Symmetry: C3
Subunit: 100 residues, 3 copies
């Protein structure tokens, strides 16, 4: 299981969500953050997208976020992939990919 | 060492904290986030993100405590994810590994 | 690759940034968070710094954040190091350390 963490330009959230929804992703968690980088504004507002995804889906998810969030201009952001050891759905107690 | 990350309904935070304190967990970090899921709002709902680093010998009990504390049985209760922490340091003391917690 | 996640006192952000800049660390992602701990006010505002860094630099980064963020008073916070499986720069498709 993977935690896909994307830092993107805020106006790209909707496009990112449509791309994810089309892939059948059932949900995601979004934070407002401050991004320091080479893009000239010493920071710009960014949006952090965190979505837990199965091993069989994570590569397509990364690709879809990348395509949807890309403008070709400096500041577009990063996608980091971290591994998730265990996952639980709080409501049902389902685990692993059933928790997603 | 584990980073236990829980996305919960905001009104469950106090119970979650009390459950963690009851297990001797000395602290935790909390963020306000927007949760997109099946629960209806209007696309997202406010959620709380709880991040707590815990030792290997405590993490299972922590995950259970959070699950029980944050459960309502209604849609939108959220998720708990367990990530592995390679190293940890307490800034004030330089303590590392479980001593950092 | 490592994700270095530091939870620090808000007034230490500038010191932490400048220390990282000295290491040629380009960017970083900053979040406003609430910290529950032994420090007495409930919670206190903290700053979460997330910086992805190469294996050959992460220890120096951890040291630099620790030295910069330390006051010796309760509430200074924590640094956690998590391993990053993959990383992509959205703008270019660059991966691994080139993504940083
Ligand atoms: N080493 C890093 N670790 C974590 N986040 C980073 C790092 N470098 C950049 N970022 C995030 O990526 C955003 C964009 O970086 P920037 O250099 O401006 O554009 P690009 O990603 O196109 O190079 C930053 O605002 C910051 O939030
Ligand atoms: N794949 C995912 N990755 C990360 N967070 C998610 C994911 N799916 C859902 N969430 C988070 O969990 C919350 C609850 O989702 P929801 O489908 O409404 O209810 P339930 O958790 O009961 O299935 C969402 O608002 C969102 O914050
Ligand atoms: N187990 C934990 N997991 C995640 N964050 C923690 C944990 N314990 C403490 N923190 C964070 O560290 C901050 C400082 O903790 P505190 O006990 O007040 O001081 P010190 O870090 O100097 O021991 C807290 O406000 C909280 O953000």
């Amino acid at each position: 299981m993977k935690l896909v963490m994307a830092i993107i330009k805020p106006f790209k959230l909707d496009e990112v969500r449509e791309a994810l929804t089309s892939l059948g992703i059932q949900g995601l968690t979004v934070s407002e953050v401050k991004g320091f980088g080479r893009q000239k504004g010493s920071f710009l507002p960014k949006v952090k997208v965190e979505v837990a995804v199965s091993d069989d889906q994570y590569e397509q998810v990364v690709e879809a976020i990348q395509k949807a969030a890309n403008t070709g201009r400096i500041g577009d952001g990063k996608i980091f992939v971290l591994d998730i050891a265990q996952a639980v759905r709080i409501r049902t107690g389902e685990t692993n990919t059933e928790a997603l």
